[PDB]
Amino acid sequence: APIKKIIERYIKSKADAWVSAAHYNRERIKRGAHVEKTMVKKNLGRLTRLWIK
RNA sequence: GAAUCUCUUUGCCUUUUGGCUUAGAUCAAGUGUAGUAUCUGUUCUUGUAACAACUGAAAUGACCUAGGCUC
């Protein structure tokens, strides 16, 4: 239980950090604000995944 | 009773793994794109006799203190 719980919490944290980041990236893309091609691709992928979820 | 050895079970053991990213990407393409670099064979290359002169070289080793004669 405890170890598992801790792991869960950290993955939640990661998600929070990740999802927010993705959102930010998307916003940037929408604007037209020096997005990296690779970064944009990642955002597209990540965002797609999020949508699916 | 004490010493030791052999086997079995439990505990202990890699009853199996040292990262992240768009599962990293793709199982497709008359490709495009940028750069970096030089080659084929065919040929040139006097004799005879007489007189004057020498009779012989080289190798390493035997003597003496690189040099000097002998074998």
Q: Please enumerate in sequence order all residues whose Cβ is within 8 A of that of A29, keeping only pairs 6 or more positions apart, or say none.
A: A35, A40, A43
How was this structure determined? It was done by cryo-EM
Q: How far is the CA of A28 from the C1' of B42 (A)?
A: 73
Nucleotides on strand B lying under 7 Å from protein C-beta: 21-23, 25
Question: To 10 degrees, what angle do helices A2-31 and A37-52 make?
Answer: 120
Q: Which of residues 1-53 of A touch strand B (CB under 7 A)?
A: 18, 38, 41-42, 45-46, 49
Distances from the Cα of A40 to the Cα of A2, A3, A23, A26, A46, angstroms = 38, 35, 11, 8, 10
CA distance A13 to A11: 5
Minimum CA–C1' distance nucleotide for A14: B20
Task: Specify the resolution in Å.
Answer: 3.8
Alpha-carbon Rg for chain A, nearest whole angstrom, is: 14
